[PDB]
Structure 1
């Protein structure tokens, strides 16, 4: 299945720290057998609506192909790190 993986990282990291976070993400995708079709580094962005107390984040986006039964494990692995604030995974098609 094709998925979009949206990751929000801590906006306060230096680029050395962010490089490590990005490397970990790519390694996890490969270790879970995902085919990585696009990586977009969106950078520092701010949630405007709805209203959040801490609206800034460092946004990363991935498009991947992988089996549905492996997505949950991958997502939880990605979010275990303290510097990964949010992970959201959307399947590009439905039944």
Structure 2
């Protein structure tokens, strides 16, 4: 087993859609005997350089422990996917499960603090500029 940080960037949007998709991303590693450690997130955010053709995004991290050759499934899940525009992995020596400075903290940060980055906002504007009901 292993221990990983996994950060990913969502198209703004899809930022409210991926929290209903977390099952999946967990799984993968929970199928395996891996675990989630963590799930936070930052809001959202500005980029940096535009990604995709937009300057904004929504940042999230999951994280996980895990088999060192099965992590990967999670990388492959992001990647094909979408949403996520993105993602990066590092690792965390069993441990850095804590959490990030913008969440520890939030709160100060946000109001207070600050942040320069982030685009909170957006998100929020979104209430709205964004609307979806299909997948």
TM (norm. structure 2) is 0.56
- Structure 1: gaps spanning 5 or more residues: none
Bigger relative contact order (CA 8 A; separation at least 6): 1
Match in the other structure for 2:91: 91
5 Å-filtered alignment, 1:49-68, equals 51-52=49-50, 54-68=54-68
- Structure 2: gaps spanning 5 or more residues: 94-135
Q: Aligned partners of 2:15, 2:74: CA distance in 1, in Å?
A: 25
State which structure, 1 or 2, has the greater radius of gyration over its C-alpha atoms: 2
Q: Given that residues 7 and 59 in structure 1 are in contact (C-alpha distance below 8 angstroms), is that contact kept between their aligned partners in structure 2?
A: yes
Q: What's the Cα RMSD here?
A: 2.1
Match in the other structure for 1:4: 5
TM (norm. structure 1) is 0.74
Count matched residues.
90
Q: Mark the CA change 1:14 to 1:8 in structure 2 (over 3 Å): closer, same or farther.
A: closer
Q: Given that residues 29 and 70 in structure 2 are in contact (C-alpha distance below 8 angstroms), is that contact kept between their aligned partners in structure 1?
A: no
